[PDB]
Amino acid sequence: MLLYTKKDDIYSDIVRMILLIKGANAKIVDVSKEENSKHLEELNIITPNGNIPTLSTDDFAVYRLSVIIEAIEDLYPFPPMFPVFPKQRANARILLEYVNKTFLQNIIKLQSPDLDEKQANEIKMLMQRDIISTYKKIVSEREVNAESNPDAQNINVLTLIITFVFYYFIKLKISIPTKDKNIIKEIKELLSEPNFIKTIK
Amino acid sequence: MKVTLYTTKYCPYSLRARIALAEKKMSTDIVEAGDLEPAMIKKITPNGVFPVLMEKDYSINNRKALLIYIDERFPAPSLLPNVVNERIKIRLSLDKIDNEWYPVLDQIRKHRSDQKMLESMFKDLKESLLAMEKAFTGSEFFISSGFTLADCYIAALIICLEAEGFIIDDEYGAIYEYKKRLFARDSVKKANILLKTLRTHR
Amino acid sequence: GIGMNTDHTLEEVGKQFNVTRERIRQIEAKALRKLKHPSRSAFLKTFL
DNA sequence: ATTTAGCTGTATAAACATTGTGTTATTGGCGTTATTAAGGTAACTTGCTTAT
DNA sequence: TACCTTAATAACGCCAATAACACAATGTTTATACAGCTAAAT
Ligand SMILES: Nc1nc2c(ncn2[C@@H]2O[C@H](COP(=O)(O)OP(=O)(O)O)[C@@H](OP(=O)(O)OP(=O)(O)O)[C@H]2O)c(=O)[nH]1
Ligand SMILES: [Mg+2]
């Protein structure tokens, strides 16, 4: 029940938010901090590439954000981030995979300090262009999932991931090309959610 | 109700899907992509994915989640372990095979044009198999008490490699314990071709 | 199981806390005793 | 100052809590009996009815 | 406008396992008190 985390990492922040929703016992460990060099070395021995965030348990150790989220869902009977219906679950999984490949990889590449200006500009432009389409698809999927079950009291992981991507876009200082007041108000409401605030502060 | 699957010849994932359907024991219609008209073949998928599967109201062209969707749709004996810890470990093992298997098959298939280059790849592959030899021993199909989806994934690689003229049983290292057992399952034994021959072909 | 897809069993709930594996049944019994009081019980009695 | 009344403290007590343990119960499974379908049968009768 | 047979289909019986009841039992929780302490009193 220990999760290895690195500050300034989008995947690690998302995993921490998922644990906070669970409110489970999470012993966050920072690989970057020199306070725990020995623990980071133990993480390197356990994990070949030392991928972060890495969830560590006595029975097993797992790597990769999607695998970690699925394992957390199996471990906890707390409100689910996945739909009761299998077709809906498959669609949500495909949407999450597409969002991770299109935006998460670009964010990781931009994170490096050796970035070139042309590559950074092209990545930012592509992210701004696809952000509206991704948000529209997520809203449509959320509405379809809600129609099947009313008052399910189930939180959708994809909406949380979109909110985290928007927060990172704000932190990078990138500009969002939306002329719609409704979209801006909805994004602000998602940013104003109380559970999200605990990880952000 | 009625379910049909579209498959491409010599595709490892297509073979994996066929094996999963055979284990599920659900009757299905199998259609070769090549036989279909080319414009018609393009119409089903604009990108063009040979292994998708066919349903009246839904279509999936994603191989990564396709096996998981097939398992969830059918409540027949599962291909995933009941124990939560084993289920978590199996997914990580599947990710490990999927993340870096392009060099094993794609590079040899197209990159190794030279006969020596194919031979150079073969020696490295044999050494990697020997390193894997010091691994799970006596497992029925893998690190599980029951048949698992991951065992189905290995079958597709074994048939594809055999088609590549790289057959190892006693020369593949000490992995012979489970290789013979895997062929035992009826669904797995569908890789390749007086009354018996005709009845089998029917 | 309210808004819960799997209607999880006692073992799953005990694992969720990571403790109180048998304590969950006692907690559920205490909750049922508290809800069985007349102030809440009387209002819900009409439906049954 | 002195104590007195005030305050409930926390141990304890009691109640709960947790653990454990028993019980049982039901799914699965197997076989089982109800049921059932089809095949087969070959003197002879070889353009109909059916109708305000 | 027959039969049935055998066989088979489908019901049904029986039996594991078992999740859940159930109690147990404590160690906790709770409440308790009554008590030496404290606030106020004086
Ligand atoms: N830092 C970091 N990166 C992550 C994490 N999860 C996924 N990625 C990266 O995002 C990309 C998408 O991975 P997946 O969607 O899981 O796998 P896929 O490539 O088959 O789609 C991958 O790049 P890739 O080049 O395909 O990776 P690889 O599989 O080739 O190593 C992967 O390395 C994470 O938790 N942390
Ligand atoms: Mg890849």
Are residues B36 and B90 located together in one domain of the fold?
A: no
CA distance linking residue C45 with residue C48, whole number of Å: 5
Q: Which of B73, B98, B129 is the last residue of a domain?
A: B73
Nucleotides of D under 7 A from a protein CB: 16-21
Residue with the two structure tokens 């031979």: B119
Residue A193 has a CB neighbour count (10 Å cut-off) of 12
Are residues A99 and A181 located together in one domain of the fold?
A: yes
Are residues A38 and A74 located together in one domain of the fold?
A: yes
Are residues B36 and B91 located together in one domain of the fold?
A: no
CA distance linking residue A59 with residue B86, whole number of Å: 10
Measure CA of the first residue to CA of the last residue in chain B; give whole Å. Answer: 24
Are residues A130 and A62 located together in one domain of the fold?
A: no
Q: Which of B73, B95, B118 is the last residue of a domain?
A: B73
Are residues B153 and B175 located together in one domain of the fold?
A: yes
Are residues A189 and A201 located together in one domain of the fold?
A: no
- Residue pair A19/A3 in contact (Cβ under 8 Å)? The answer is yes
Are residues B49 and B140 located together in one domain of the fold?
A: no
Total domains present in chain B: 2
Are residues B19 and B103 located together in one domain of the fold?
A: no
Q: How far is the CA of B78 from the C1' of E12 (A)?
A: 29
Are residues B89 and B67 located together in one domain of the fold?
A: no
CATH of the domain at B92: 1.20.1050.10
Q: Residues of A numbered 75-94 whose beta carbons fall under 8 angstroms of chain C's beta carbons: which are they?
A: 75-80, 82, 84
In the DSSP assignment, the letter for residue B54 is B
**Resolution stated for this PDB structure, in Å:** 4.4
Are residues B62 and B128 located together in one domain of the fold?
A: no
Enclosing domain of residue A106 = 82-193
Position B79 in a domain:
no
CA angle (A115 as vertex; B101, A177 as ends), nearest 5: 95
- For residue B131, what are its two tokens? 């390193």
Are residues B23 and B60 located together in one domain of the fold?
A: yes
- Residue pair A176/A170 in contact (Cβ under 8 Å)? The answer is no
Enclosing domain of residue B114 = 84-189
Q: How far is the CA of C48 from the C1' of D14 (A)?
A: 36
A30's enclosing H/E stretch is strand A29-30
Query: Which residues in chain A have Cβ-Cβ distances shorter than 8 Å to C28?
Result: none
Are residues A98 and A180 located together in one domain of the fold?
A: yes
Q: Do C18 and A80 touch (CB under 8 A)?
A: no
Position B157 in a domain:
yes
Pairing of strands A2-5, A54-56: antiparallel
CA distance linking residue B30 with residue B165, whole number of Å: 27
Elucidation method: cryo-EM
CA distance linking residue B130 with residue B34, whole number of Å: 38
Are residues A56 and A146 located together in one domain of the fold?
A: no
Q: Do A1 and C18 touch (CB under 8 A)?
A: yes
Q: How far is CA B25 from the centre of its chain?
A: 17
- CA of A11, closest atom in ligand 1: 35
CA distance linking residue B132 with residue B143, whole number of Å: 14
Position B109 in a domain:
yes
In the DSSP assignment, the letter for residue B105 is I
No. of helices (H) and no. of strands (E), chain C: 3, 0
Position B195 in a domain:
no
